[model samples]
Target: GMELKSAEEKSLYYRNKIKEVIDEVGKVVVGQKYMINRLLIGICTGGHILLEGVPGLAKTLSVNTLAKTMDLDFHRIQFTPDLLPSDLIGTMIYNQHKGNFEVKKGPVFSNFILADEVNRSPAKVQSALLECMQEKQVTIGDTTYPLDNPFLVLATQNPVEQEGTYPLPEAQVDRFMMKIHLTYLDKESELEVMRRVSNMNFNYQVQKIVSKNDVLEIRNEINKVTISESLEKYIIELVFATRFPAEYGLEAEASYILYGASTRAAINLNRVAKAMAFFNNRDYVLPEDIKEVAYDILNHRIILNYEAEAEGISTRQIIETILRKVNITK
Candidate 1:
């Protein structure tokens, strides 16, 4: 292992690189600072993301612009009702002369994938994509091909339109590390967007500031960030409170939740908290780190029952309640 001082220097490099990326992304995508930060958090953790928003929110544009800033192969797949598994995972074609079936790779072979309108696809297609997100491999015929390292799936869906959309299966939802919901920009931000669009000479080019190798190194470094024993337990207690609410004084909210977060929630919370600490140029995690990511990490994982839906209660409300009730102590 290298010296601790070397690691500290490397962490500083990571902080600088992250800032450069955010700035570059900001040039192309206006507003949604919250969305941008969550996207970076997802990328830093090497996790798949599910983004929910209406059309024209730049969900696709944001992912595309971010991909341009990073040195990685980027592919955007538009999911439709007629989309098939073979469309995403590839298929086998028989060569008449060779008398053998060759494996044809699909769009998912890239390092970064933007699955646009993912909910429009059928279950089979969603499963095909989820399998890649979960196992990081694609089976085309009898052969299973491993995806590239640092592979990330950033999927989008429209929250306002559900008529033709297929609800993502719970099993498929579990595979995603976090689910982020984007909203309309404030009036000032929208006005800025109009000004940028009306300007004839406005440039849309985004420079590549970080390489794939740099991202891999940053991931390794994030794992090295310190988390105290008390903080570690704090992570567990937060997750457990979701499963057994009464134990944490959440008995009233327990019935609203059909199912609590799985073990993956605990794992993702810790990983993302480390990413948050890294973003702040720190080598150790803080309770605020956990608090910052708890909502995004646990929102989708916590399934709400009919009662909660009828009452118009949101997962965010329940998460906020948990955060308020749970205290930190050594």
Candidate 2:
């Protein structure tokens, strides 16, 4: 903790540290503030992110830049149609020189990994990474190597361009905490990018803002953030509405939901909501916090069927409908 004389100064230090990171990142990456924030939120919450965007959007660059900024070991695995499991998590090799077999490690050993174009690989290759994602460890033959602390996986997939891409299995999708969709840059941001590139004036040097030990401490602190009883009830009510919409006066419209959110959905909503409040220097949770991050956390988790897709029913629309039912004025 910062030893500042006043509470205001203490808050300033925290906010400035976060802003400093954002500013540093902004120099290299022109737009997509939410993408960066979500990346931080994912790591802070010990979750993973799935990025959907076309090529040339800096998806890999953003993750690489973030890795550099944090001073973490960075590795990028380019998923190909023929990429094998051994390519990521290493395999044992016979050493003729030493007359013995030794295990070789793969790119998964890094603290931060960018699984670029993950959907391009076969199911088996993807599963190798997913196993690491679930347990943060890799088991080679009879040995298991635990991953370092603050392990993060940011994967990129192109939307609507199904060619040469193996769609991510629905079960695997559940493992991701948030599925972020990146679009083309806005005119202003694009112009800014051009100016920076032309002048070569944009510079960023990321210093160590938080340590691995501090990560656990900050996570524990976020857990201690206060959530009012009323607001907690409100979060529950909102989740319940997803399960039984008709009972809550949402008739056939709610029927489009083939499946409701899981228990983890509510858990994520609550955790990330409190995290957002903490990131903004608040020590408590509010309904607005829940409202702010609801869709991103739940959109991918909520499963929909033929009727919903045929009728153009989307997760955002369903979430919005439930939000209306909850009716929090603030």
Candidate 3:
């Protein structure tokens, strides 16, 4: 009991630091409060993010600004059609002087990685990057290098154009904990953005408010947030409903879904819910917390069929159906 109290206190203390980051990022970012919060949830849970938005929505800029506020190495890779596996995960170079193959680590070795336009890359590059996201390690030649602690990938893709892009495979997309969709800003926010950017000499510098060790400790504390068994069952049923909608009274919607969310979706939902609870300065999971993050967690995981696509059915609509039909209490 004493230890639990101590953990709660620590969590409360870290909540302020998390807010500090949000404030720092907000200094330059005009709006998109939900996007900022979702990104922080990923940071707290040590999960990767798949961000989709039209160009000029600050998808890349927000990530870059967030990286500036952290005490960690940040690297941005512009994923293009010509990008190679070795380009992302590094390669080996032969040296006559050393009489051996020298390991040349790639930009992915950094603590925070911004993979801009991730969908533009080919399958091999996507696989290499996803492998790092899943394994937390990169294999170069005969040597494997473990990624740094608190390593987070904020990958972005342009939703407006798909002409020459290689869409990420379902298997790789599932590795991401959440897929956030960003839209255009409101008029007020857009005016604010124009004012901020109108200054040609404006140079915004963000402070490094949180240390790497601090992030590691906060993640440990977040993992201790209380989740009731009923909530666990609730989360599981939510995912299972996507697979077997008829069993859960979602028969009509079942035909719309080609594939249900995998087991990973349930795991990520629970993790993000706990992180959401932590964000609210609480130590217990609430149904609302799961509901808040449900869309992002299940958006990319659930696959819709041609029938649903032709009918203009969206994953968000399907998620809402599950949330509405799935019981909160056993």
Candidate 4:
């Protein structure tokens, strides 16, 4: 093993690993750096991600391709209305040796999981999907089994249909650390994408860049990164603003918000920012680091009322305003 005495040296090493992984994924998917980087943060921080995007944005392509660049088990579950718990979670097999029922793990058992079109399923199916994400383990008749350690579910929601979808409630949605909105690629990336897909061969094999232990070590480095008291206070005020906007001089938005950000929002703000710090090869987190992930973590947690919708106020606009209005001590 190479000597990496200083954490700085190791951070640089891990950063190199991230670059190579991205390069491998780029061989297939084009210009999804935002989605790809957030997913990397999810893997590094063990935070489950909720993807909101229209179809044909390579949501699945990026996720599965990402799995290819790492040494992790990847499974994609298409959440159709008829997908049963037994199908999604497993078919329980009778174990005579243990004199009880044991779980035959399903797609959720993998290290990297992708639940596609999550809202299409009913509540029963939705709950089944969420349980593993919440617990990081599955329960059988009498015994429980822990899932893989590096479990990061990248669940997706197609924005097209609410009529046939089971929309996740605010509380349930808060389970995810960050909810990302995946948009279209640029004209250049899209044209290259078309050019690549137009080929009859259409084969790109990705080699694994980082192993399980390597991921855990990157996480360890992020955990060791320091956040100052001022920044911690900064995180608190952001969440509080969403709950009671007027207190933070958001008088116009006060009536617009139906509910505030959850405790998860504040906690994840701190966590994801540390990840941002690690990405920059810094041992300390900055306010700018926190700002990078604010929109993703807070957007899902904040609830807007009919008034906000009436005024055509987006959650993004509210977050952008919050960032400006919130003070960061020097």
lDDT comparison, 2 vs 3, better candidate: 3
Q: In candidate 1, what residue range of length 10 has the lowest lDDT sum? A: 53-62
Which one wins by TM-score: 1 or 2?
Answer: 1
What TM-score against the true fold does each predicted structure earn? 0.91, 0.86, 0.91, 0.91
- Expressed as tens digits, the lDDT of each residue in 1-330 for candidate 3 is 499788667777788899898888988887778777776777778899887864374555676777778677788899989998888888567978989977678789887788988888898898888889889997777888898888889888887664688878788889999988767788998898888878887677889889878888888878988999999999999999999999998887888888999999989999999998988888899999999989999999999888889989999999998899999775
Model 4 poorest ten-residue lDDT run:
53-62
lDDT of 1 at 287: 94
Assess candidate 1 and give its TM-score to the true structure: 0.91
**Runs with alpha carbons beyond 4 Å of true place in candidate 2:** 1-15, 55-57, 91-101, 198-205, 327-330
Candidate lDDT values, in order? 0.84, 0.76, 0.85, 0.85
- Cα displacement (angstroms), candidate 2, residue 274, comes to 1.4
Which residue runs of candidate 4 sit more than 4 Å off their true CA positions? 1-8, 54-57, 92-103
- Write the number of the candidate with greater lDDT, choosing between 1 and 2: 1
Better of 2 and 4 by TM-score: 4
Estimate candidate 1's alpha-carbon lDDT, on a 0 to 1 scale: 0.84
Give candidate 2's total backbone clashes.
Answer: 0
- lDDT value for candidate 2? 0.76
**What lDDT, from 0 to 1, does candidate 3 have?**
0.85
lDDT by residue (213-323, candidate 2, tens digit) is 555555666776788778777777777778778888988646787767777677778889888998888888877899998888778877778878988888898888888
As a whole number from 0 to 100, the lDDT of residue 107 in candidate 2 is 84
